[PDB]
Amino acid sequence: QHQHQHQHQHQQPNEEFRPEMLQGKKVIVTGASKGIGREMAYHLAKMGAHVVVTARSKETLQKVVSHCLELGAASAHYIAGTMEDMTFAEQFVAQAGKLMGGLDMLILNHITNTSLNLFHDDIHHVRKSMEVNFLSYVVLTVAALPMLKQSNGSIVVVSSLAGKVAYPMVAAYSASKFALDGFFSSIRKEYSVSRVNVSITLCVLGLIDTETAMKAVSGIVHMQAAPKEECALEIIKGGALRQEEVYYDSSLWTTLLIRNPSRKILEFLYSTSYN
Amino acid sequence: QHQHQHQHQHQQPNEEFRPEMLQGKKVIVTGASKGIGREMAYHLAKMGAHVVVTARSKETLQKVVSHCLELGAASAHYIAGTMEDMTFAEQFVAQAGKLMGGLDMLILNHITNTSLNLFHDDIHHVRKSMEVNFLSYVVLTVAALPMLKQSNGSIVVVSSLAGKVAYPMVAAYSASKFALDGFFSSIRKEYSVSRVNVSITLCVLGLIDTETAMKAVSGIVHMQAAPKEECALEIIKGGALRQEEVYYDSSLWTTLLIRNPSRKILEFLYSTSYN
Ligand SMILES: NC(=O)c1ccc[n+]([C@@H]2O[C@H](COP(=O)([O-])OP(=O)(O)OC[C@H]3O[C@@H](n4cnc5c(N)ncnc54)[C@H](OP(=O)(O)O)[C@@H]3O)[C@@H](O)[C@H]2O)c1
Ligand SMILES: NC(=O)c1ccc[n+]([C@@H]2O[C@H](COP(=O)([O-])OP(=O)(O)OC[C@H]3O[C@@H](n4cnc5c(N)ncnc54)[C@H](OP(=O)(O)O)[C@@H]3O)[C@@H](O)[C@H]2O)c1
Ligand SMILES: CC(C)(Oc1ccc(F)cc1Cl)C(=O)N[C@@H]1[C@@H]2C[C@@H]3C[C@H]1C[C@@](S(C)(=O)=O)(C3)C2
Ligand SMILES: CC(C)(Oc1ccc(F)cc1Cl)C(=O)N[C@@H]1[C@@H]2C[C@@H]3C[C@H]1C[C@@](S(C)(=O)=O)(C3)C2
Ligand code: NI
Ligand code: NI
Ligand code: NI
Ligand code: NI
């Protein structure tokens, strides 16, 4: 109905973010029982999206779903399961899309539990890292793609500074996050040439103040953590705007130094050869 | 005995490559039945190294082993098996080190069979890519590390331009090669702080004229391929000199553009904070 005539607007030749870009949109959020995943569920609810949230803990997901509905979600549902289970991953998306009658955005956020430790002999954690953090994202993507091709939708992949540069104590985790870049940046190029109108947003996040991260770094690293609330909002904005990469960190020097113009230029040369 | 007094030498304040750096050294080469792996076996034989070569095809490995001995290898052995089998991977190294009485260099070269195709639905190839191309390298590394800690030896990891930048048609392969960078660059940092004197050399190679690559790219990509013989030699030189990364490509613009000074600087800042 009413407007707010005192609220400022900017002048342009073009485009910004508005919540209406998510109003009535059909969105899956994975790892949504806590942290950034949960915050993203909430933001999307407030924007009047349809949300399907997932994670292992059904009891906490019930709470998220309940709060989503309170905040103004168009609809809110959960399906419980582990992303170690590739059959679940595949069935979760089909079930999520039937609930909503479609899919506009796939937000891939979950990771297997990880701590800061030097590597020796924990091959299982390495495999489990690759399966949960990387392989399930590929399985979810494959299941989701027919629906996303219909809606010209978006895949949002949550990664890390440790998915662009190296760090000790997180080798397995870092390997999986690098793998995400390798894989999705490659299919992004494939979609460009096969005219698949599905955007891919890789999100490169510095340290975020979730309980899990703050516990993991206690006494080992002494650094600023960015607020989980806005981090979650920035992820959604990047995906909604169909941006290839999103950067979010407490430090602006860091966000400066994770860009790779050489790689952009090398890839630009390969595709100008193709063009 | 004799010298060659007409052969030139350079002036310095320090260091170059000499074959003697491999004389009597104990070296594992994986994927050594053909291509770059086989060429590396040969180079090492000529330098009078002890070699243990592996791959699935025992009949071709017998030939490699035979030619290695002819070229002047200190000793030459093969152990056949698939790197899909993590128990084999682990047992191969123990068996290889017993054969040689130690280990100076682990050369990780093998990949699972891959072709140029757009990605859809081949989740098995993606998993198999991660297991063979990435996971087995971690298992081999873990098995090998006690021996390498003894000899202050070296791990040489064969990667690709598709392990530093993105390319269509090789998403699964690219994901695994990115994973290698993530993982080994991280443990390199860990070894630095835990005073583990084992070098890690990540090799970033452009297109090489092996039969397998040349078949894979026929009619799809029209580019120069560098000779497999020298590529193999450059890999060995980089590892012997304990260099963190090696670049080899037909094009010098390409080798210019795969360096990432931003990443070096970001990591340099993290370790100056630690220092
Ligand atoms: N926080 C940071 O400082 C930081 C920095 C860089 C990147 N990131 C990235 O941001 C994302 C979220 O981070 P966060 O700190 O908010 O993590 P978090 O709070 O620990 O949440 C992880 C979520 O994934 C779910 N999950 C864990 N294992 C699962 C499994 N096997 N199958 C299905 N779901 C599983 C968890 O729910 P259940 O346990 O109930 O299953 C939880 O909801 C991750 O991708 C992370 O790598 C975070
Ligand atoms: N050639 C290029 O243009 C190029 C470019 C960039 C990077 N590279 C990298 O260079 C390395 C070698 O390349 P290449 O072209 O010389 O490859 P290649 O000729 O096809 O050799 C691959 C080797 O790995 C072995 N292998 C395959 N599957 C295996 C398995 N499951 N278990 C154990 N061994 C297995 C093969 O022997 P069996 O079949 O008998 O097992 C073979 O000896 C690879 O790491 C590749 O990614 C190559
Ligand atoms: C930005 C990074 C690189 O922060 C660091 C980590 C380690 C360092 F050495 C330095 C830094 Cl800056 C990062 O991604 N950290 C996360 C964080 C803390 C740990 C490790 C990583 C996974 C989690 S998780 C998902 O909750 O399992 C656990 C959450
Ligand atoms: C340098 C790269 C990126 O060359 C390209 C590949 C695809 C492109 F689109 C462009 C370019 Cl430049 C590269 O690594 N190619 C190899 C080569 C050819 C194919 C794919 C890759 C694995 C093999 S293999 C190991 O023998 O399975 C098969 C051998
Ligand atoms: Ni109002
Ligand atoms: Ni404004
Ligand atoms: Ni002579
Ligand atoms: Ni000279």
Q: Which residues of B touch A167 (CB under 8 A)?
A: 186, 189, 270
Q: Which residues of A touch B172 (CB under 8 A)?
A: 183
Q: How many CB atoms lie within 10 A of CB A93?
A: 26
Check B139 against A123: CB less than 8 A apart. Answer: yes
Q: Which of B30, B40, B53, B56 for a ligand 2 pocket mutation test, highest count of atoms within 8 Å of Cβ? A: B56
Give the DSSP letter string of chain A: ----TTS-----SS----GGGTTT-EEEESS-SSHHHHHHHHHHHHTT-EEEEEES-HHHHHHHHHHHHHHT-SEEEEEE--TT-HHHHHHHHHHHHHHHTS-SEEEE-----------SS-HHHHHHHIIIIIIHHHHHHHHHHHHHHHHT-EEEEE--GGGTS--TT-HHHHHHHHHHHHHHHHHHHHHHHTT---EEEEEEE--B--HHHHHHHTTT-----B-HHHHHHHHHHHHHTT-SEEEE-S-HHHHHHT--HHHHHHHHHHHHHH-
Could you name the CATH architecture of B18-275? 3-Layer(aba) Sandwich (3.40)
Structure tokens that stand for B11 in this block: 């002036």
Question: A136-152 as b/e, with b when 16 or more CB fall inside 10 Å?
Answer: bbbbbbbbbbebbeeee
Half-sphere exposure of A89 (CA within 13 A, CB side): 22
Q: Report whether A175 belongs to an annotated binding site.
A: yes
Q: What is the resolution of this structure in A?
A: 2.3
Question: B20-57 as b/e, with b when 16 or more CB fall inside 10 Å?
Answer: ebbeebbbbbbbbbbbbbbbbbbbbbbbbbbbbbbbee
Q: How far is ligand 5, taken at its centre, from the CA of residue A22, in Å?
A: 19
Q: Which residues share a beta bridge with B248?
A: B205
| DSSP element (H, E) containing B42 | helix B35-46
CA distances from A67 to A56, A76, A124 (A): 18, 9, 36
Q: How far is ligand 2, taken at its centre, from the CA of residue B273, in Å?
A: 40
Give residues with Cβ within 8 angstroms of B275, minimum separation 6. none
Q: Which residues of A touch B249 (CB under 8 A)?
A: none
Sequence letter at residue A55: A
Three-state DSSP at B111 gives: coil
CA B92 to CA B94: how far, in whole Å?
Answer: 6
Check B126 against A259: CB less than 8 A apart. Answer: no
Pairing of strands B75-80, A50-55: unpaired
Q: How far is B98 from chain A (nearest CA, A)?
A: 21
For residue B152, the 8-state DSSP code is: T
Inter-residue contact B72 to B50 (CB < 8 Å):
no
Residue ranges per domain, chain B? Answer: 18-275
* Residues 67-86 of chain A whose Cβ lies under 8 A from any Cβ of chain B: 86
CA distances from B246 to B202, B231, B233 (A): 6, 10, 11
C-alpha gyration radius of chain A: 19
Structure tokens that stand for B246 in this block: 């090696």
Q: How far is A182 from chain B (nearest CA, A)?
A: 4
| DSSP element (H, E) containing B182 | helix B171-193
